[PDB]
Subunit: 115 residues, 3 copies
């Protein structure tokens, strides 16, 4: 029932409008913040294009008590020209917990929904 | 309740809106309809939608498109540039009204290709 | 509990075994909730529609099929559910599959990769919808 889609340091996103929405989840500084604890399916798609040739696209759990981010779902990819990266998966999130998208070195998005 | 998984059928330009199997094998429709390539919503609300397209400048586009207004609103799209094979997957939660339709297109226009949705 | 599971960290079954990828089921981000696990398979307890998914992290040195397959009683052959063919000096590539399938009590789903090489980089999960 809680859910969020969000559209194109951690990455940053539009949280309204049109396709962007928050619904039972907060936001601050690129991150989805969880209010109701449970299992969420979290996902992110990132469009890439260019001209280690190796890009990493990840979802990370941040907890304010701790600096260090914990990896959740992570993809590595090498490559006139376009590549798209998608990650999805289910994670147990407690109230408080935040999730961000990072990509190391419009079309893209970031989202979740409780399952 | 509402959910569907549709699997690739033999189309068919224009873009074009891919056509789908709704009943044989793994395909099914449960609380959603289908009309000429389109999943059609019946119960308003937030749906996770997805499509996977098996591909087989030289640049392919894969997208999920809403109809309501006139015209087609891009919902989710990827570009890629691949004896070759590649696969393109898109998913995400979008709000849909009873009456809205969702379709799939790929440029330079599949059996391991599919299209589906469920209410979230 | 709405049945669900997330399994992590693929590795291959014993060479010559014929078996599928094996996964971590308890530690870290891995859990099983209202599904069971047996030698690589998620085993369905409660019949219905599930969104099943798997991501596999690929990479080598110089065609790969990543699939989710169903095992059903008295059917010697694994049935395809969702499959992807990809074809990529070191390289890296990731393959994601997701989709809603109907599964009966007693049915099993496994993940395979052809050919297998190949925590957070590889995974296999599901939830009832």
């Amino acid at each position: 029932n809680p859910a969020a889609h969000l559209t194109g340091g951690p990455l940053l996103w539009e949280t309204q409008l049109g396709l962007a929405f928050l619904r039972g989840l907060s936001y601050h500084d690129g991150a989805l913040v969880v209010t109701k604890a449970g299992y969420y399916y979290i996902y992110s798609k990132v469009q890439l294009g260019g001209v280690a040739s190796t890009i990493t696209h990840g979802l990370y759990k941040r907890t304010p008590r701790y600096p260090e981010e914990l990896e959740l779902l992570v993809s590595q990819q090498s490559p006139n020209w376009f590549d798209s990266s998608f990650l999805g998966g289910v994670v147990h999130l407690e109230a408080g917990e935040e999730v961000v998208v990072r990509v190391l070195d419009t079309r893209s998005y970031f989202g979740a929904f409780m399952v």
